């Protein structure tokens, strides 16, 4: 075949890949990938005030999807809600004492498992492909 | 890192527009996808456990999804001539219909995926996603 499709399938497969390896790590915390990947970066972010919009550009997700990911986590007892200074209306997102005990795990694996995942790969192929990424996801 | 991240945002912003396409035909962006696999190797006969292989996915993901396929009339199957104890899949004339229209969108997909890349730009990117596959 004159194209092939190996761009697009493989992209899927990635992903998804790293979507099952996240959720096997995460329920051993008793934790989905996803919010695994929440905690992950307020982590990274206790320097400055994360509003839910911040955490909907970092990871391309709708207010609506946000909205309910955020709700269950605090129902959870991982985050809570706090109020802002940057923004005087806005509340910023807390991770609480249960969620911080679970940090240097979390994030020895979020160093782990990318690092694993990239593990065969150059420096500069990784570079490639997060700047070939950063386009894709933009002109959607 | 940001990796990880953009890899996720990429794959279900791919999906996402897959299935608004799909929808369309009264197809999951899955189904859709199947089709155009199958429109694109009718020179092979492909088992289930090719399209595990091609699509790397569980047998038992496999079974539900071509399960689905074949109670809406999209495939059927039939005795293979590599391997008399498995049955390849096939194409009905319902999902003939639809496969020009599948080719080009997934065509037309991809161009403006690549849009601004080189060819070897595209093969290395495809090369470097193979590898991380293998980790
Ligand atoms: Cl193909
Ligand atoms: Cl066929």
Request: hydrophobic share 35%.
């Amino acid at each position: 075949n004159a194209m092939s499709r190996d761009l697009g399938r493989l992209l899927k497969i990635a992903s998804n890949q790293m979507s099952t390896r996240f959720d096997i790590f995460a329920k051993k915390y008793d934790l989905t990938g996803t919010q695994m990947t929440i905690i992950d970066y307020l982590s990274r972010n206790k320097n400055k005030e994360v509003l839910q919009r911040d955490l909907e550009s970092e990871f391309s997700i709708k207010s609506s999807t946000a909205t309910v990911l955020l709700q269950r986590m605090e129902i959870k007892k991982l985050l809570y809600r706090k109020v802002s200074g940057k923004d005087s209306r806005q509340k910023c997102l807390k991770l609480t004492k249960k969620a911080n005990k679970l940090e240097t795990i979390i994030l020895s694996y979020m160093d782990s498992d990318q690092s694993q995942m990239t593990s065969g790969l150059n420096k500069e192929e990784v570079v490639f492909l997060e700047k070939i990424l950063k386009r894709m996801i933009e002109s959607d």
